[PDB]
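Re: the multi-chain job from yesterday

Posting the exact lines I submitted so nobody has to dig through the queue logs.
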Amino acid sequence: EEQIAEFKEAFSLFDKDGDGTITTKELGTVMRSLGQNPTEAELQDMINEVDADGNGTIDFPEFLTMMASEEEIREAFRVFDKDGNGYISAAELRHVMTNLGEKTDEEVDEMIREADIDGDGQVNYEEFVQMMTA
Amino acid sequence: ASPWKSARLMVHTVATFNSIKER
Ligand SMILES: [Ca+2]
Ligand SMILES: [Ca+2]
Ligand SMILES: [Ca+2]
Ligand SMILES: [Ca+2]
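And the result, structure tokens for all chains:
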């Protein structure tokens, strides 16, 4: 169905300059913001594996075709949990989301409450998986 | 809104890219 609405949005998080296509650079930066260090070669292998046209960029229709686990998440958690204490504070949550692509404390504290099962005011690993595995 | 759907989307897409790379 129109779940193509979630992929379109996912596509837009990558298609940063919104020119309709994802490039090698534009892919590397998002992957870096999430704790990875892909090489330039890996950035063209991945694109070309989705790039059916022969351009070097991925447009939405191509992206959709492609779009149709612990370590990636445990790795994301560590990007969030900047001081590695097992808890994502409200400060760390801001710092990382503004690095992921975002500019308030009502927006951040709403985030915490939306996943704060035990109610301690911060986000642990367990609570983290819940918001990543939908 | 939902800063979390955004994060989840990015993470999950990056994982799929890693996958197509390995498949
Ligand atoms: Ca783009
Ligand atoms: Ca193409
Ligand atoms: Ca922490
Ligand atoms: Ca908590």
